[PDB]
Design a protein around this nucleic acid. Structure first.
Ligand SMILES: [Zn+2]
Lengths: 206, 37, 122, 46, 48, 180
RNA sequence: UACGUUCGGAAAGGAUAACCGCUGAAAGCAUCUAAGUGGGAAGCCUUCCUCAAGAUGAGAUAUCCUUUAAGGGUCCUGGAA
RNA sequence: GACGGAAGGGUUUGGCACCUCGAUGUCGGCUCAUCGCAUCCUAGGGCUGGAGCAGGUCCUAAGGGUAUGGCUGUUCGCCAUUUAAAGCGGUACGCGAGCUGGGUUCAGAACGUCGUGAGACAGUUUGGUCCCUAUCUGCCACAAGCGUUGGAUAUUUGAGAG
RNA sequence: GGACGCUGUCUCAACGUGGAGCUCGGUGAAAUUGAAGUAUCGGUGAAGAUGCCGAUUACUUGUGGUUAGACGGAAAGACCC
RNA sequence: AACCCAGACCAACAGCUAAGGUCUCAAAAAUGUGUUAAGUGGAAAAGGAGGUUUAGGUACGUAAACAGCCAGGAGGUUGGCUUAGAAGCAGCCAUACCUUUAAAGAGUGCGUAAUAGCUCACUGGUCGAGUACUUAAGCGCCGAUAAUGUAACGGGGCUAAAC
């Protein structure tokens, strides 16, 4: 599956030729290199290891350094992922942004924004109690279980706790524009993560 | 159609069979078809 | 964003002057109607001795809303009062003339005859 | 009435539904005259 | 001695060719529960 | 048991039969067919004829007697004369056509049905409303004819659909039969 | 943050429920079943997204280190947390 | 499908008085649900006295969904508009150490009825304190420690679960 | 009981403000308490089990939250006899 | 706790037995003759039932029974009718109605206003032994059907490790 490690620059909008506005998210692609390969007869499966923006030479541990010993003029890469079942490339290669030039839809994977310790009403769209008529119940859970059967709280009952921070992959984002000279992709819609967080863009499954 | 507990022939042309462990009636008069509950 | 209990100006010459929304059609929990939707109204005030009496229930189409709704080209049109037009059984305007402007989403919702009888389409 | 969209492929070919048969399976699928690419739902040919 | 571990170890080979009798091949069920409500999953001998 | 189980099997001259290790091969003018035979039943070829008997007298063996007799008989009649089952397409605007190893059916649906013909089986047309499936195996011929019929099962109000030729469709009435 | 924007419910495959079969007995016929062999649903199993080797059954690989090295932690400046 | 006959379900009104009166808080509404299928809708069928449309009856199927208001404390029901449908039940007639206190079931007062009277009434009307900082299990989240048989750093196959 | 006006009462919640809450330093209770290397399900039983049976699941130990249970705490039940 | 076996004076790293068990968790079984295909065993009714073992009746048969296959399946006669029709098949009555009789019923069903029309009992040929209806028992099948979780064998599993 064709994929790339990009950085979510932000959002904007563009004007189609006839006047229709399209809200887009912009992704900037630092150069991506193929660092190694995984093979079915040696690792158990076939995949390509892909890496991106470099690290500072004072903060590369020697295991990471030795990972790149045999590669020529490829500094250590901070973001490393795997692309399963891909061919047409080998160690030392380098993937342009134009691999999406023939693609209509993409999928983007990133780390969603963190919202801290969040309550039930924000986390699960719980309604609350009334704010008047004598109520002493505003944004609490309400009841949680049943009385004596089962005499416990079922596993998975939704309560308060931390919200967001998980990975998430959003599907079928239309591809609006590709700009090779500035290494940018413009997709239509929202992309998980805060500004400057790093996403992975894959060719759409459908 | 007539998922019943007593399945009996209705006309002389109805016939009794047993299929995969249930008792059934089959006939030309499809209105007579039956299976035990 | 017309919901239930909203007051509306009847913008045609049937006789009614104020209508009240009592249902938003086409959807189970549907809560808001926009320009070009059909609602069920009761008449709360009418011109005396007209063909429309106070307290009758009809279907009406929304022609002006006070909350702006996005269009494809990015433009938003926000009127200054909420207004509707009464319809007969065929989902066609019961009246013969329409007062004031209407919004052009009627065009897309296929109310061409309301659009034509309007004075200005914005 | 926004003009009835002509049921056209992204490659300018008409899209027509055929019913393959294979091994007890009726299959419905969408076929493009110009490019003969077989897909199964015209969503995938627009 | 039941207290302690004094028996030998066992390697089973050809474990995929055990034969059953009756309709067990179609009817024996292996159940499991995820501990979440309603999360009861069955699995017949074939599929397992 | 019953006489079909014990009735002897004649062998046509052009047809050869052979039995070995729970298997039977029947090679004829038009093809070769194979069959499994269960342990409890014994199949013998003697004097240009086939005989079947049972080592046991359990009811499974009783049924097997007739089952394998009939199969081997249909296995021999196929390699000599082949099996053929025919069909008729009746109804306004219903058509059938052939291209290579597939049939195209126009049966009122908004799509024209293609139909791959499985190997080992031939299809014959008579105009555009009559079909005849021919082949070496009665089982396969019946299967194909059945699946084609299932493509558009007949109906009783007007006889429309794809019917077996030998079948008789019971018929009902609609509007005018209920006339008072 | 929604009242806003965008996207999502799939397509395909496997095994099945009721049902319809084909070939055929016991029971010369007949019969969807007893030997076999097929179709068949928002259900079941794969497929989509997320968590996941405390899976103690603790997996697999690439690189670094060989008497305290590799590496990690504390402290400090902070954040997209 | 009458007249009769045989069962299951444990939800209705009851029977019994076995646990609890050195206290097991009682009806509805709010919030949050989870499960059963005897299926309201969507899905797959058999037969129709099923032309078509629309149904009737029966079988399979619990994945998802299953309305907003008027009256009443009401569950229920009726009614107004909708909707593909406005399902039936269990869970202390789910859920008050989560909320409300309109109803019921205290002391005020009034009406009708009963009583000579004090008062009484599953008759009515009006007013009337809803307490507790979570030790344990359970659940929602996040860490410390160690293990994974030399010790570490990245990338991941996936049982299993949502 | 109805109407006008007005409004976050509500559709439908969002953001901000002050005191608590959270972390650290100082001072320092309480009701309660047979103890405790105190899980779940289907059962059984003084008829609703953390302690019994069979099976399933679960590394050790804390912190911030939530009240389903421990027929929770509080008052030798006020109702009934 | 109330059922079955059995009355604890104390001690022993002895033996034989009761109830209940002897694949395994879990200390203890093997062989003989049959039955069961439903995991029945390891819940249950009215009723339905070409499941099967064994035993016994009544029909019927090597002088050809049953099923299939090939024929006739009629003439008098629209049986008289009720009715409008009823021709065998709305409905009344019997059909002690006869003949050619191989055998043909005042017709078994389907379907026609009414027939018409298609079929059957009925009997003849091809085939070649048990068949067709019942009775008593031994095991089985459906009926079988609630709500936290397989949950009506204690579990694993068992075609015996079931009866
Ligand atoms: Zn019949």
């Amino acid at each position: 599956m064709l994929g790339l490690i990009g950085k979510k620059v932000g959002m904007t909008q563009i004007f189609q030729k006839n006047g229709i506005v399209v809200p887009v998210t912009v992704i900037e692609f630092q150069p991506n290199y193929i660092i190694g390969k995984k093979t079915v007869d040696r690792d158990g499966y076939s995949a390509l290891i892909a890496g991106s923006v470099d690290l500072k030479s004072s903060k590369v541990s020697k295991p990471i350094k030795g990972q790149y010993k045999s590669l020529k003029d490829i500094e250590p890469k901070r973001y490393v992922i795997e692309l399963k079942g891909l061919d047409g490339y080998d160690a030392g290669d380098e993937i342009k942004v134009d691999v999406f030039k023939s693609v209509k839809y993409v999928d983007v994977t990133g780390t969603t924004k963190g919202k801290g310790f969040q309550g039930a009403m924000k986390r699960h769209n719980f309604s609350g109690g009334p704010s008047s008529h004598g109520s002493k119940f505003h944004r609490h859970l309400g009841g949680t279980g049943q009385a004596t059967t089962p005499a416990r709280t079922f596993k998975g009952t939704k309560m308060a706790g931390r919200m967001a921070g998980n990975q998430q992959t959003i599907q079928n984002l239309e591809v609006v524009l590709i700009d090779e000279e500035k290494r940018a992709l413009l997709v239509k819609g929202a992309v998980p993560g805060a500004k400057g967080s790093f996403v992975v863009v894959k060719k759409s499954k459908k | 159609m007539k998922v019943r507990v007593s399945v009996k022939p209705i006309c002389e042309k109805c016939k009794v069979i047993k299929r995969k462990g249930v008792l059934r009636i089959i006939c030309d008069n499809l209105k007579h078809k039956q299976r035990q509950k | 964003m017309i919901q239930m209990q909203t007051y509306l100006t009847i913008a045609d010459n049937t006789g009614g002057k104020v209508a009240q929304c009592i249902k938003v059609l086409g959807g189970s929990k549907r809560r808001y109607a926009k320009i070009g939707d059909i609602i069920t109204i009761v008449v709360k005030q009418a011109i005396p001795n007209s063909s429309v009496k106070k307290g009758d229930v009809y279907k009406a189409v929304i022609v002006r809303t006070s909350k702006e709704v996005r269009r494809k080209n990015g433009t938003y049109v926000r009127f200054d009062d909420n207004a509707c037009v009464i319809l007969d059984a065929n989902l066609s305007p019961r009246g013969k003339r329409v007062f004031g402007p209407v919004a052009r989403e009627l065009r897309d919702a296929n109310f061409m005859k309301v659009v034509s009888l309007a004075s200005e389409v914005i | 009435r926004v003009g009835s969209k002509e049921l056209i492929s992204r490659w300018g070919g008409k899209i027509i539904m055929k019913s393959k048969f294979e091994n007890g399976k009726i299959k419905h699928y969408a076929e493009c005259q110009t490019s003969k690419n077989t897909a199964r739902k015209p969503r995938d040919l627009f | 001695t039941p207290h302690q571990d004094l028996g030998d170890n066992v390697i089973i080979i050809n474990a995929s060719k055990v034969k059953l009798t009756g309709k067990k091949y179609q009817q024996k069920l292996y159940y499991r529960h995820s501990r979440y409500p309603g999360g009861l999953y069955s699995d017949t001998f074939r599929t397992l | 048991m019953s006489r079909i189980g014990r009735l002897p099997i004649k062998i046509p001259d052009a047809v050869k039969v052979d039995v070995k290790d729970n298997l039977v091969i029947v090679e004829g003018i038009r093809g070769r067919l194979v069959q499994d035979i269960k342990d409890s039943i014994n199949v013998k070829v003697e004097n240009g004829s086939v005989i079947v008997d049972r080592v046991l007298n359990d009811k499974k063996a009783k049924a097997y007697h007739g089952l394998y007799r009939s199969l081997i008989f249909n296995m021999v009649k196929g390699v000599t004369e082949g099996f053929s089952k025919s069909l008729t397409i009746n109804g306004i605007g219903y058509r059938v056509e052939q291209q290579g190893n597939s049939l195209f059916l126009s049966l009122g649906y908004s799509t024209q049905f293609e139909y791959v013909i499985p190997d080992g089986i031939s299809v014959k047309l008579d105009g555009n409303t009559k079909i005849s499936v021919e082949g070496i195996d009665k089982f396969k011929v019946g299967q194909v004819a059945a699946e084609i019929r299932s493509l558009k099962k007949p109906e009783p109000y007007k006889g429309k659909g794809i019917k077996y030729d030998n079948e008789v469709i019971r018929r009902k009435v609609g509007k005018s039969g209920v006339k008072k």
